[PDB]
Design a protein around this motif. Sequence first.
Motif, PDB file in Angstrom:
ATOM      1  N   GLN A 101      44.070   6.880  33.605  1.00 25.32           N
ATOM      2  CA  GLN A 101      43.042   6.793  32.584  1.00 25.32           C
ATOM      3  C   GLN A 101      43.572   6.942  31.176  1.00 25.32           C
ATOM      4  OE1 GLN A 101      40.203   9.678  34.032  1.00 25.32           O
ATOM      5  NE2 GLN A 101      39.193   8.074  35.243  1.00 25.32           N
ATOM      6  N   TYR A 102      44.720   7.595  31.014  1.00 20.93           N
ATOM      7  CA  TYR A 102      45.356   7.786  29.717  1.00 20.93           C
ATOM      8  C   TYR A 102      46.773   7.244  29.701  1.00 20.93           C
ATOM      9  CZ  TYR A 102      41.319  10.602  28.827  1.00 20.93           C
ATOM     10  OH  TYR A 102      40.016  11.030  28.649  1.00 20.93           O
ATOM     11  N   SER A 103      47.228   6.657  30.803  1.00 22.95           N
ATOM     12  CA  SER A 103      48.563   6.098  30.901  1.00 22.95           C
ATOM     13  C   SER A 103      49.641   7.137  30.654  1.00 22.95           C
ATOM     14  CB  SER A 103      48.745   4.882  29.994  1.00 22.95           C
ATOM     15  OG  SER A 103      49.605   3.960  30.645  1.00 22.95           O
ATOM     16  N   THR A 188      40.632   4.492  29.862  1.00 28.25           N
ATOM     17  CA  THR A 188      40.295   4.498  28.449  1.00 28.25           C
ATOM     18  C   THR A 188      41.089   3.483  27.626  1.00 28.25           C
ATOM     19  OG1 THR A 188      41.888   6.195  27.719  1.00 28.25           O
ATOM     20  CG2 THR A 188      39.820   6.967  28.715  1.00 28.25           C
ATOM     21  N   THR A 189      42.033   2.768  28.255  1.00 29.25           N
ATOM     22  CA  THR A 189      43.059   1.997  27.563  1.00 29.25           C
ATOM     23  C   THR A 189      42.929   0.481  27.724  1.00 29.25           C
ATOM     24  OG1 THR A 189      44.676   1.783  29.373  1.00 29.25           O
ATOM     25  CG2 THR A 189      44.591   3.909  28.253  1.00 29.25           C
ATOM     26  N   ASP A 206      40.524  -1.231  35.559  1.00 30.88           N
ATOM     27  CA  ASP A 206      41.785  -1.882  35.238  1.00 30.88           C
ATOM     28  C   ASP A 206      42.841  -0.851  34.891  1.00 30.88           C
ATOM     29  OD1 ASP A 206      40.769  -1.432  32.435  1.00 30.88           O
ATOM     30  OD2 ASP A 206      42.687  -2.366  31.966  1.00 30.88           O
ATOM     31  N   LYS A 207      44.086  -1.313  34.904  1.00 31.73           N
ATOM     32  CA  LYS A 207      45.214  -0.549  34.387  1.00 31.73           C
ATOM     33  C   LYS A 207      46.085  -1.473  33.557  1.00 31.73           C
ATOM     34  CE  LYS A 207      47.821   2.870  33.507  1.00 31.73           C
ATOM     35  NZ  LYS A 207      47.857   2.253  32.156  1.00 31.73           N
ATOM     36  N   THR A 216      52.988  -7.137  27.790  1.00 31.94           N
ATOM     37  CA  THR A 216      51.583  -6.766  27.651  1.00 31.94           C
ATOM     38  C   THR A 216      50.921  -7.215  28.946  1.00 31.94           C
ATOM     39  OG1 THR A 216      51.799  -7.369  25.291  1.00 31.94           O
ATOM     40  CG2 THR A 216      49.612  -6.852  26.119  1.00 31.94           C
ATOM     41  N   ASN A 217      50.424  -6.256  29.737  1.00 33.61           N
ATOM     42  CA  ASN A 217      49.954  -6.533  31.076  1.00 33.61           C
ATOM     43  C   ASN A 217      48.607  -5.874  31.337  1.00 33.61           C
ATOM     44  OD1 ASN A 217      52.529  -7.627  31.687  1.00 33.61           O
ATOM     45  ND2 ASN A 217      53.278  -5.694  32.536  1.00 33.61           N
ATOM     46  N   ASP A 218      47.896  -6.384  32.338  1.00 34.43           N
ATOM     47  CA  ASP A 218      46.679  -5.723  32.809  1.00 34.43           C
ATOM     48  C   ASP A 218      46.418  -6.193  34.228  1.00 34.43           C
ATOM     49  OD1 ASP A 218      44.412  -4.057  32.594  1.00 34.43           O
ATOM     50  OD2 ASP A 218      43.253  -5.520  31.422  1.00 34.43           O
TER      51      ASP A 218
END
Length: 261
Positions: A101-103, A188-189, A206-207, A216-218
Motif C-alpha cells: 500500500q505504501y511500496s 495509495t500509489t 493494483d501495485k 514505470t510499471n503497474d
Amino acid sequence: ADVQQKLAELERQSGGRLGVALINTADNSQILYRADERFAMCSTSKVMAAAAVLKKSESEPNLLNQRVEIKKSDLVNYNPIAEKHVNGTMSLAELSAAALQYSDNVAMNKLIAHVGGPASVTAFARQLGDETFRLDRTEPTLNTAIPGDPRDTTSPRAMAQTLRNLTLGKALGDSQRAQLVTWMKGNTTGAASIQAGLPASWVVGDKTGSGGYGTTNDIAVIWPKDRAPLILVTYFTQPQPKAESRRDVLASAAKIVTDGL
Ligand SMILES: *[B@-]1(O)O[C@@H](C#N)c2ccccc21
Ligand SMILES: [Cl-]
Ligand code: NA
Ligand code: NA
C-alpha cells in the motif's frame, strides 16, 4: 488488431519499450504487446513477496502476527512506514500492507527475508506454475532495471496469468486471497497509472513499480462496472539511465486496451 496499432503508436511516441498483457475473464481473451519479453518488475514484485508470505500462513496461521524488529540498520532508500517503527516491531501482516500500500522497501526486504530470500520467492512462483518470474535481489538494488539484465524480471504475460491466479483464482486460500485483494485495493500509489486510464466508477486493486531507466510499471485486477473482472499488466522502460517516470504511458495503454469494455 487496431488495438495493436494503437499500442505500437503509443510505444513509438513514448520513446521506450512497452509491454502489455490484458486478460478479459468474460471470454478468456487476451490483448498482448511484447507480452513474452522480460521487463524489470521493480516494486510490482512486492505482490509476489506478500503472496508468498500469505501462502506460508495457510499452514502456519499465526504467521501474520509474528513480530519483526525494525532497526536503523534495516532502513534503505524508501521507508515511508518502516521509518516510523524503528526500534519497535511490525507484524508480517503490517509489513505486507506496508509493502503493498505504501511500496515500503524495508517491508519488502522483511518479506523476502522471512520466506528465505529472493530465490524462495522465485520458488513460490514456480510452485504456482509461473516459470518466467525471477526475483534475484533485495531492495534497493532490485530496481536497477539495466537494459539486457534479466535479474528481477518477468514478462507481461506471465505476470498477468499469475496475478489472475492469485486474485481471481485459488492459488491462495479463501482468507489469503481476500486479504491480498483487500491490500491491493487499498494501494495509495496507483492513481496516476492504470487507474488514470479507466472510468472513475471502476474498482482497481493494483501495485505500481518504478526504477532505473525510467522504468514505470503497474499490475492490476480491475472490476469494471457490470462486467467480469480484468487483469492488466503494463510495463514500460526507457533507454536513458536517468529517464523520468512515465505513468501517463501506462494510463494511455490502459485506456487503449479497455476501450469498449
Ligand atoms: B518500487 O519500484 O520501489 C520503491 C522505490 N524506490 C517504490 C516507491 C513508489 C512506487 C513504486 C516503488
Ligand atoms: Cl469517468
Ligand atoms: Na510473473
Ligand atoms: Na492503477
